[PDB]
């Protein structure tokens, strides 16, 4: 993880995907000033284990494509450092059910 | 035997062969006797359910089954409780009626 003050040269950004499996998450200092997750409107997120996932898909009889999708550029996605094909769980507090689970999958 | 003109009557007959006999001009031949499986087309009579609609039809409420009561004159008659879901008021308004032709459908209307 590398935090920068203002901006980075494009060459440096290009060199970021040069060490598989290892990755480099790059955040702006000014962007991290406030944690977003503490905000009221953001319900709790949980990343999942592949075994848990395969259970999820089997139980609802789903293809990965059929899950509600979440995009990598999403601030939350960046926050948890998600990668493609990784499922997240969301618990939102509902004004009808009162606890409502949900599932999404990074693009 | 009541023919088309009297209300409780039949317009056409369909033999099991799948052939329609128009009851006008049938009397000239003079007799018809029904056999099981033939389909007779009868006038609407009391209690036949019909869909009933007032456009623009933006509610699922705006199309509802009904149970026919044959009455004279011209306008469709209907109770006023049902005027609200159709968003209907009685001045020059019109309502399309739809008769289902199949026993199956006829059932669905009554039951849904």
């Amino acid at each position: 993880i590398f935090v920068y003050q203002n901006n980075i040269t494009p060459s440096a950004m290009k060199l970021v995907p040069s060490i598989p499996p290892a990755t480099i998450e790059t955040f702006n200092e000014a962007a991290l000033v406030v944690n977003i997750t503490h905000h009221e409107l953001v319900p709790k997120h949980i990343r999942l284990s592949s075994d848990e996932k395969r259970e999820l898909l089997k139980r609802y009889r789903l293809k990965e494509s059929q899950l509600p999708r979440i995009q990598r550029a999403d601030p939350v996605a960046l926050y948890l450092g998600l990668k493609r094909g990784e499922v997240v769980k969301i618990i939102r507090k509902s004004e009808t059910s009162g606890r409502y689970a949900s599932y999404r999958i990074c693009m | 035997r009541n023919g088309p003109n009297e209300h409780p009557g039949a317009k056409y007959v369909i033999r099991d062969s799948g052939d329609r006999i128009d009851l006008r001009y049938s009397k000239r031949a003079g007799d018809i006797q029904l056999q099981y499986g033939w389909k007779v087309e009868r006038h609407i009579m009391d209690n036949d359910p019909v869909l009933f609609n007032r456009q623009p039809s933006l509610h699922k409420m705006s199309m509802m089954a009904h149970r026919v009561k044959v009455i004279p004159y011209s306008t469709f008659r209907l109770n006023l409780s049902v005027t609200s879901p159709y968003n209907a008021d009685f001045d020059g308004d019109e309502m399309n009626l739809h008769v289902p032709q199949s026993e199956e459908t006829r059932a669905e209307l009554s039951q849904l």
């Binding site: 409107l41 509600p68 999708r69 979440i70 995009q71 999404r104 | -």
Partner: protein, 110 residues
């Protein structure tokens, strides 16, 4: 957050009018506008440009263009869509016809 915020935005114009609509319906709407992972407008642009069956897409807005792009890309249409089955005049997989009725011999003997 986009989702919840969206629901809040919609819910306002309704309570503003004084009308009341059940929570469910608005919730369903929002979720449809969402699951793509970004806010999907309801326009010829937003949903109509998704990958759902050609017939279903061409019926809503731009019919000739959708049909040409379909035939260009040799697109397949499963015909699980409502409007598609309608155009073909066969019983839709909804409501009454979401399942199928069969005769069993077993109970029939008894």
């Amino acid at each position: 957050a986009g989702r919840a915020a969206l629901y809040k935005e919609v819910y306002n114009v309704i309570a503003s009018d004084g009308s009341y609509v059940n929570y469910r319906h608005m919730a369903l709407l929002v979720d449809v506008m969402t699951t793509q992972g970004g806010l999907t407008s309801v326009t010829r642009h937003g949903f109509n440009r998704s990958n759902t069956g050609a017939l279903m897409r061409c019926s809503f807005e731009e019919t000739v263009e959708i049909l040409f792009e379909a035939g260009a890309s040799a697109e397949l249409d499963d015909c699980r869509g409502v409007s598609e089955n309608v155009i073909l005049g066969q019983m839709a997989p909804i409501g009454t016809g979401a399942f199928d009725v069969m005769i069993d011999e077993e109970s029939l003997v008894k």
